Amino acid sequence: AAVILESIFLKRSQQSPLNFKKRLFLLTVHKLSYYEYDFERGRRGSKKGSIDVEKITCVETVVPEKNPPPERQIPRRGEESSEMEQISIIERFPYPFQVVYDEGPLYVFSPTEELRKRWIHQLKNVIRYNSDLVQKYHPCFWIDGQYLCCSQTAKNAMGCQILE
């Protein structure tokens, strides 16, 4: 079923210290998938996983990390080169969004706000007919065994904030 979006994003892996990995994400009408990227040949490398779109309960932005490492900091502008600074789009991923399903949240970092907006808008569209949409979500990341927003310690805890 047609490719809706295809992007290189930094994702937080399921667990140990948190691990972030640069992966290609593919949205079709029924599946969200991710791949090791084959940079040299310009293709999808090895498929690493998939979830059914119909298992998604919620998709929203995530309050940014207070102390992000450089890989997730917003570029200052002109600190890399004099003009045409575009390679940041595969080097820096400071705009995070979350896909909630049964297991709890998947954290994905987008290199630009516009790309994050498109992914959220297209994800909301494809999950509109989902049976288990929640009207409550966590605005902050779950880190060190709890959600920063409400200190709850089940990854599948009901959201502490209502959705508009």
Ligand X SMILES: O=C1Cc2cc(OC(F)(F)F)ccc2N1
Q: Give residues with Cβ within 8 angstroms of 73, minimum separation 6.
A: 92, 94
Range 84-143, binding Mg ion (CB under 5 A): 91
Q: Which of 34, 95, 107, 142 binds ligand X (CB under 6 A)?
A: 34
Total residues at the site for ligand X (CB under 6 A)? 10
35 neighbors 24 (Cβ within 8 angstroms): yes
Choices 32-40, 61-69, 71-79, 126-134; region in contact with ligand X by CB under 6 A: 32-40
Nearest in space to 109 (alpha carbons), one of 97, 119, 118, 121 = 97
The minimum distance between CB 80 and Mg ion, in angstroms, equals 6
Range in contact with ligand X (rule: CB under 6 A) among 31-39, 66-74, 121-129, 130-138? 31-39
Residue 84: φ, ψ to 5°: 50, 55
Is residue 106 involved in binding ligand X (CB under 6 A)?
yes
77: which DSSP letter?
Answer: S
Contacting residues toward ligand X, per CB under 6 A: 11, 13-14, 32-34, 49-51, 106
